Each structure stands twice: as C-alpha cells, then as structure tokens.
C-alpha cells in the first residue's frame, strides 16, 4: 500500500529527513505513519527498489517548486493594498471540538460560560484550553473561584475518557451562534481620526469632554492624536522652534529612531555645523534601546503639543 511505501521511504531517507517531512505532514498522517512504522519487521531489496522507483517517478512530476503560500500571499497583499487590507484578507481566508471551539472565542464570554459549572470542570476545561486563553479567562473570575481553580489545577490527576467525551458533548450543546464572532471595525483610533477632522472649536469641546470623563483614555487619545512620524508634514519654522525647545541628546536619539526623511528634514532645519555635529555623534555612538528612543520621542511630542497650544506651532 501507499502507506507502507511511504513508511519504507521514511525509514530509508534517514531520521533527519523523515523528521523534516513529518514537519510538513498533518497530525493524522504522522500518527498513521508512526503506527505503521512501529509494526515494520522486514523490507526486502525488491520492495526497497520498487519504493525508490515509484518515489522518483512521482517526484519527476513534481518537482513542483514548492512556495511558502502563506508568506508569499501576505507579502503580495501587503505590497498591493497596504497592511490593513492585507491583514483583513488573510483573516477572511483563515476563517471542531467543543474545547477547541472555546479557544476560538472571546475571553469574557467563555469565562461566564464556564463560570456556571463545577470548579473541577472549570479547571479541567482551562487545562484543556490554550494557556493564553485560560489566563485571560482566569483574570476575569472572582478571587474565590480563581483561588479554587488554581488549587484544583495544582492537584489535577487526569480525567476518564467517558467523562471527557460527555464534557465535550455538553460544551458543544452549550454553544451558540458563534460564527463570525466579534469584528474589527474601529474605536479610539477612529475616534481620534474623527476628532482630527472636526473644527478647532470642536476639538476644544473635545479636550473639554474627554478630560471630563474617565481621564485615562483621554490621555491615551492625547498621545494617539498626532504621532512623531507626522512631524515631516509640519512647516519648517515649527521644526526650528522644536529644535530650539528640545535638548540635543533627545533630538539625536529621536532622529536615530525615526526615518531618514524626517532625520534629513530636522538636519535641514538645523544649522550646518550643528547638523554635522549631530551626524558625527550619531555615527560615533552605538545602538539605543527602543524604550529610550520612544521616551525621548514622547518628550519631544509633549514639547510639540506645548508649542502648538501656545500658537507657536501649527499642526
């Protein structure tokens, strides 16, 4: 049979080659081949030669020049329609057991679903669930239930297959219209974009109301509205004022972390000697951690906001 021929091929190609092939095979195929492999006792020379001949004849046809379909498709979609459309199309293309289905669900919904269950059952399901999903679910539980689950998981001794099957059937029965669960449309960022499109008086009202509410997401939107990479679109005088109001080291670090166009714009806005000194210091220095560069850019953006509010800078 073809399974026996594949088993002989895997035996005769070497452990490394067979292991590499199994990395390109599904779980069912790997399990079936391994089960067939363990029962192999003899492989005669005629059988070996026939297997080699058949495999070579099949490989003559393909010879398919295998391509990484996922990576190539992602790159094509990105370079064609941007990151957002590419990611949306990949999600559409990508889109089962009850436990596996729960792993494909929202944390709060699954948490409330299993919350109406015996704590041992909750612990068993969470063990059978993905670690990240289980951690998200447990963070939403009450302190007493969370402690009980953590205690039970620390003393988990395995479940009977019949109990596992019954639990899976119950979870399947409890399922709802989870098809196309959740949707990425917008929020916060879209609100910031809309605010940027509303009048100066309207954005004054916006500052007012956002400060009035929770305050935390208000500051988050303060940070979000306008970014450091948007400084390239500002007029030269505002950039020069920023150079005046920004320390040399912070500006140098920010330019190091920024794009060559923004760096060249800042250098042009600087004097010749100062720009040359900045370039020499950049060349003579070493790599800077991303966190430090981000902090310096945040400080520079705070200075930008301060100058813009006073009217010295136009955004």
């Amino acid at each position: 049979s073809g399974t026996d021929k594949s088993v002989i091929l895997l035996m005769t190609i070497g452990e490394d080659r067979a292991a590499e092939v199994f990395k390109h095979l599904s779980t069912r195929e790997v399990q079936a081949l391994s089960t067939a492999m363990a029962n192999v006792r003899q492989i005669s020379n005629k059988q070996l030669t026939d297997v080699l001949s058949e495999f070579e004849q099949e490989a003559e046809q393909f010879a398919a020049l295998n391509i990484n379909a996922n990576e190539y498709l992602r790159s094509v979609l990105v370079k064609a329609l941007g990151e957002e459309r590419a990611s949306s199309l990949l999600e559409d293309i990508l889109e089962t057991s009850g436990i596996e289905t729960l792993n494909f669900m929202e944390p709060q919904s699954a948490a409330d679903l299993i919350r109406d269950e015996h704590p041992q059952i909750i612990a068993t399901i969470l063990v059978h669930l993905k670690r990240s999903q289980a951690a998200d679910i447990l963070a939403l539980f009450d302190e007493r239930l969370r402690h009980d689950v953590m205690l039970r998981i620390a003393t988990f001794g395995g479940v009977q297959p019949a109990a596992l099957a019954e639990l899976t059937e119950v979870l399947n029965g409890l399922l709802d219209g989870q098809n196309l669960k959740r949707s990425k449309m917008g929020g916060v960022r879209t609100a910031a974009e809309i605010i940027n499109l509303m009048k100066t008086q309207q954005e004054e009202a916006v500052i007012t109301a956002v400060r009035e509410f929770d305050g935390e997401l208000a500051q988050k939107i303060i940070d979000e509205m306008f970014l450091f990479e948007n400084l390239v679109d500002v007029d030269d005088r505002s950039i020069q004022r920023l150079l005046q109001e920004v320390d040399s080291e912070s500006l140098l670090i920010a330019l190091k972390g920024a794009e060559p166009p923004l760096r060249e714009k800042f250098l042009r806005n600087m004097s010749q000697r100062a720009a040359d000194i900045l370039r020499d210091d950049l060349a003579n220095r070493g790599p800077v951690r991303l966190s430090q560069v981000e902090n310096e850019q945040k400080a520079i953006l705070l200075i930008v906001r301060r100058l813009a509010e006073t009217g010295e800078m136009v955004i």
């Binding site: 049979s1 073809g2 399974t3 021929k5 594949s6 091929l9 895997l10 005769t12 190609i13 070497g14 080659r17 590499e20 092939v21 990395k23 390109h24 095979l25 195929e29 079936a32 081949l33 080699l52 495999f55 070579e56 099949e58 490989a59 393909f62 010879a63 398919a64 295998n66």
Partner: peptide
C-alpha cells in the same frame, strides 16, 4: 543501492511530504 538513494535524500522535504500524502490518499 546506487546514487539514486543519495539523490532521493537530497530532495526537498515538502516534495517527499506531498508524495506521501498522495500515496496515502491513493490507499
């Protein structure tokens, strides 16, 4: 045991996986 074994060992693992899948389907 000629050089055919070495040539097969040098083939791409994806090709071997596809051949194995085809044989399993034909089973």
């Amino acid at each position: 045991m000629s050089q055919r074994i070495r040539e097969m060992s040098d083939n791409d693992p994806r090709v071997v996986a596809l051949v194995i899948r085809q044989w399993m389907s034909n089973d």
